[PDB]
Symmetry: C2
Subunit: 665 residues, 2 copies
Amino acid sequence: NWTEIYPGVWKATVGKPESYDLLKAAGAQPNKDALSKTEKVSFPFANGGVSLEVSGGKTYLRFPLQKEEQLYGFGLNFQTVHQRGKILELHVDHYGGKDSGRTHAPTPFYVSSNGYGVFINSARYIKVWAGTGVRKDSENFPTPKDRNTDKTWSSRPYSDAVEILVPAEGVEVYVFGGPKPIDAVKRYNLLNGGGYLPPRWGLGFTQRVMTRYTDKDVEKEVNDFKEKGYPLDFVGLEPGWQSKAYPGTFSWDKSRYPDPTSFVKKMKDQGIRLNLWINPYISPDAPFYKEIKPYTGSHTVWLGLVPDFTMAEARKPFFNQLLKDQIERGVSGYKIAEVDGYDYYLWPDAAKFPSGLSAEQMRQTYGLLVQRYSAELYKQRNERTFGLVRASNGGGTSFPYVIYNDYYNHQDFITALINSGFAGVLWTPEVRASKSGEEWLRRFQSNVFSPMAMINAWASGTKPWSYPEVEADVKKFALLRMQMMPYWYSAFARYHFEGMPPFRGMGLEEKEIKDQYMAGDDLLVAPMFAGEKSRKVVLPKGKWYDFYTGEYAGDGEVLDVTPGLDKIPVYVRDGGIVPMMPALLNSPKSNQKVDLEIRYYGNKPGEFKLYDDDGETFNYEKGDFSWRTIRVEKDKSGKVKGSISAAVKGKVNTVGKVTFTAMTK
Amino acid sequence: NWTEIYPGVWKATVGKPESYDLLKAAGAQPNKDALSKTEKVSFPFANGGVSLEVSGGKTYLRFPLQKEEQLYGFGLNFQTVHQRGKILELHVDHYGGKDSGRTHAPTPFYVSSNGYGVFINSARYIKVWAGTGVRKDSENFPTPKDRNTDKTWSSRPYSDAVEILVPAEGVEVYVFGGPKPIDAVKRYNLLNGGGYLPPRWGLGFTQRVMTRYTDKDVEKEVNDFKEKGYPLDFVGLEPGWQSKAYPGTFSWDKSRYPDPTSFVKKMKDQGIRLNLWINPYISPDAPFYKEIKPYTGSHTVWLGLVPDFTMAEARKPFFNQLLKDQIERGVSGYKIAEVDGYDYYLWPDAAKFPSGLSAEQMRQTYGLLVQRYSAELYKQRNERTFGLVRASNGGGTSFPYVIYNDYYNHQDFITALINSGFAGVLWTPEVRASKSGEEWLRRFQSNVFSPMAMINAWASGTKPWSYPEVEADVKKFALLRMQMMPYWYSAFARYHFEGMPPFRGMGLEEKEIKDQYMAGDDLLVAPMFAGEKSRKVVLPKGKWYDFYTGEYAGDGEVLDVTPGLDKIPVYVRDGGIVPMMPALLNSPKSNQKVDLEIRYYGNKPGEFKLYDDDGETFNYEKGDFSWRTIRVEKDKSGKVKGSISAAVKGKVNTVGKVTFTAMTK
């Protein structure tokens, strides 16, 4: 039966749940304070139709559906957003080109258009029939028809329930109330701890360089960024930083990085952080190999041992090496690769791990484990991190990682960004290479309207400026990313404090749209793809304004837009506010005041809550942060009038001179 | 541990096997006599490396591989024949366009090129890693390499074992000795009971007619066959024979079939048998609906109830209706459709059945159940049947059904025919429609070199003669099918008595070839596909002769062949014999003597065992059958010399005048 454990959050324990699951894997702590401030709402299933049973070694769940209902979620899908009528097996994997449930974060959480959500807290592979079963004893059992004579016969008759099968003798289930879909997602994310509060530097530009780069090659590339006037906060090092890779030594290569301490410091003195590639698979030449070997699984991945990170005996040596050899030299973070799949790379489900944990549960949670324990090392030092990971799951909302992959279809990259908001994880549609300048720019445009602005040149060697046809426009979008930092930072603060995903699908205000997303509270983004001169944009009710010119765009209608190569279609809600700092090339330091220009759109009076703190430590946990309320409207004459609430005694204040701009003439 | 239960057959019971499995589902009885006559051979795993364990609710199996080894089988695959390096989940389904283990007969049986086989007797979904796992404690653990510096680094390092995971607390496993791959397949098939011994009429031509045909429409089509001089033994009726379909009444429609008894008799008096389409899903208008309803599952398929055929209470009413309303009127057999998938048509794994059997095991065996109990009704009447089914599995070798599907890629249709020989089931690459006469003929050509010569015109309304460009050649191939009846019948006798699959891949004498198959003992078939003027044919060592002209073709070499539209490339082994009866339009009756022309190929002295019995009852089980030994060679002058062994006192003898022809001038 259902215990209301928080406002709008109910928990049921069915049968005998397993001792390991997603929340336990992640060590996810609920944000009780934030949850306590959400509305009491009533239980979303008010008219029965809920069934929870254990039989033949499995847990059978059924949740009812109404005729109107559409469903969202079930993880990081790339080709679909509406989930009703889909059949899935949720299974961590590298994305394979179709939506089957095999994906980087196959989060067992779904949301209904009626404003509720359901989370199945199991680390097993989970089967989902999202309204396909037609039960003989249903209250909505359609009348049988004779296909021989009746042209209305249906090959897929009406189904009135979500059915879920968990291969275990019980399970914990959570249900989240509304009243809106976004309310259920926020409560889910808060139950997970809220999103990570990223460092400001994490929201700047990152360049990953070719595998083979030496320390000298990186220093030169850094100098070229500076010389050309492009932003850069952190550089990604790829497998060549290690003395061996696939499998790895987790130790700096002596020929390419002869003096790691000096290198890391030189970069940091120029404002440049480093983010290091790893996969967690262990070389016989790693310095902790012999120590860790008894605490690794039966099967290897690219001839590397697989640590059982549920065991302290594997974690201590692995994470001590990261700490001592890298983090204590100044390394800012990691890119955790190849913790997803494919099945022919990773260990089989037939593998055995020394803790006794099934290879299945290990597969479902390995990404979560590496995120968890790596993030801890930074938190212990009162320092934020921000990096990349190729696998996550339910339980992972609070971790400082963005999902990326080795797939590349641009349309599908945007669809995954939409679905990230339903999945309790972050996703970046990264830029690598391109056949044309046009495609390079379209990809860069969408990428700067995402969790992480990044070119990953591991194989391509490209730089922002590598395509001369679009060079000037790429630079503009790179500088825009920096100017928007206060907007993004505030959105990420909402993710942390309120559970509000910073990127999400349409229809999520507080037919399927697979190619538009909200970015923060105020911006509707509708990317162009290479080869297109124009697209349609579906605007929600309420008035919207062009991001660039401030001019009225529309209201609850469809636009045909021909933006040009130099613009990504972006629209701002009436009264929407985007605070802009100067076009700095490096994120500003905690002791640095920064001017803001408050760009105000439309005519409805606007209100924006600007988040402010030191941008890099966990001092915010002790209360050292502020929300500055910004209000803007136009007076009788049509002239802009703005205010900002007063700085708070004793708190960090990085807000400099504030000016206001009415974008809508 | 391993009990030698028959010559070259070993059984191990690991843990606690489930009470239901594939062999029990099928009620498969071993052919002990035939098995007792195979060679004692030694256990195929002589040097350890075999592991059988139960852990965490699952059964983990590992079987070693050597460097040389290639693997075949794992069911009815459509795009692959070599299985080493593949990962599969064996799951009954309609084929979905790729080889994942989801297919009509996902037989959990594999064969090695080293001459052994392994069968996993579980009715669960079974996961297979066929040499992809790389174990840290392997005796062949490759040396780790540094991908940063070593260009020989492998993304898929060497794997030395087949690994299998069964989701249950134990399992029965069978191992089959050699010394050749074909020996292991034969023993597997014999353990299943051997193949069904089909009626001769089952090897004739069958036409399935459009869904809507009335009794009068069928009588006319029959008259057109006769008038045009095309063969026909049985007509397929499609869903319109029932008063309702999807779901079904299992009762003759009163408007389209007003007098069933008279109709069936009229057809039978003209030599024409009937084969009726069913799916097993029950209409509220079926006459046994109320009786059967408590013995049906929770979920419906196209609004039809799903009988639990493991319960006598479901079988009795269902099969009594078939018996009384159809079989006792003269109906010869059935086409059992839609017992495979897709997942969105069939019941979810979350469904519940009144016997308590998991929906999973029901999914894996439903085809087997319908085959089993329907075949029984015929056997009880001392009458053979022969029909079609869209799902089978391990345990199904002995049933009188051929697999077909609703897919159509021709290349893949031939690949499935190859893989049928590894899977213990029969498959027909059926003909339906085509965009060109060329394609129609190429499809008809391969189809008459298969288990069932059939056009399925359920939607297309086509007849053999519907494409005028190729009409004359289709007729020739239809008549050839009849003339070859003694060849096919004898091959099917070998399937029954010896386990020898009548259609099989290359290299199976007693790189991957996906487009040639052996048909009987003597014929190598290499189909053309539409759009091709020529193809390569890979001939095994030993001499081969052109089927049509008898001329030497080659020996252990590759040919480039341009056969023309009018020929399918077929080659005959040196000394090969094809007995030919006259081009009859209807299969000959049990009391009818038939002349044979013995077509003898090459110069090596040949020997052929001609099977003979009444062709339609189970009297053969009481010993009323003969094998007539035919020997042929050319004398000194190069003139043919032949013999046939003497007819056996008291036995059926349908052999008339016998003449001999040396095809190789």
